[PDB]
Write a protein that binds this ligand. Structure first.
Ligand SMILES: *C(C)CC(=O)c1ccc2cc(OC)ccc2c1
Length: 248
């Protein structure tokens, strides 16, 4: 990975040491980006709901993962299940149970820094993983991206600024998540997010991280070309909120 500091450096070092799993996947890969584009053609707002027990920005919710997932299965274009242990209290078992309980696309949300974590996501039933430009060297990004695609996954490439975007396009990203929060400082900058979004080619499937506000953000960003929206805290706190966000 890249040289980092603070909690980010810690979690990356932890992740390099993540014991890999053995398991045989049950179902073929269900494409998250393809389902996003199908929602777009059907005029259905595409929201990625996230299961995440804890976050370095203080989120702290205990709730049943399966009931959360089965509820979301009816509304979300996909699910993002955080499997990072130390800062998010996630686990691989949580992913495996959710993956076998629902039939919508699943993103394994974690710090992917080695090939065996992609093995893990595939074996556990995830359909895709994120690859974060801020933590991986360009050589790592390109190679992990090839590796995941060899399984039939299309990873989402996470970007925070223009340089991240330049790298993502250079390495052949077709599925991009524009973060509003900086991974290192956890600062949110929506202006820079909107700015980044206007720089992305039309043929890239674009997911914007959304949270504070929502609804108003969804309408405005959707006009800027955004294809789907990933949301964490507000949905962990009030799952039924997704319905109003999609409808009235
Ligand atoms: C973009 C949608 C990538 C993504 O979904 C995501 C969300 C949250 C998250 C939290 C982490 O902290 C443990 C790691 C990765 C990750 C990826």
């Amino acid at each position: 990975p890249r040289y980092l500091k603070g909690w980010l450096e810690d979690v990356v070092q932890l992740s390099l040491r993540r014991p890999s799993v053995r398991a045989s996947r049950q179902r073929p890969i269900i494409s998250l980006n393809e389902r996003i584009l199908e929602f777009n053609k059907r005029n259905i707002t595409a929201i990625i709901a996230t299961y995440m027990r804890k976050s370095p920005w203080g989120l702290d919710v205990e709730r049943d993962p399966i009931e959360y997932a089965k509820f979301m299965e009816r509304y979300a274009v996909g699910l993002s299940i955080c499997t990072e242990e130390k800062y998010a209290n996630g686990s691989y078992e949580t992913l495996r149970k959710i993956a076998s309980s629902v039939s919508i696309p699943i993103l394994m949300a974690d710090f992917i820094v080695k090939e065996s974590q992609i093995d893990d996501a595939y074996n556990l039933g995830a359909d895709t993983v994120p690859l974060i430009v801020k933590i991986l060297t360009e050589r790592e990004l390109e190679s992990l991206l090839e590796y995941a695609r060899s399984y039939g996954m299309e990873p989402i490439i996470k970007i925070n600024d223009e340089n991240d975007l330049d790298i993502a396009l250079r390495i052949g990203a077709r599925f991009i998540g524009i973060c509003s929060r900086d991974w290192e400082t956890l600062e949110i900058n929506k202006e820079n997010q909107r700015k980044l979004i206007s720089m992305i080619p039309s043929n890239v499937v674009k997911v914007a991280s959304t949270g504070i506000s929502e609804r108003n953000e969804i309408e405005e960003l959707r006009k800027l070309g955004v294809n789907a929206f990933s949301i964490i805290s507000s949905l962990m706190r009030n799952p039924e909120k997704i319905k109003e966000l999609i409808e009235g």
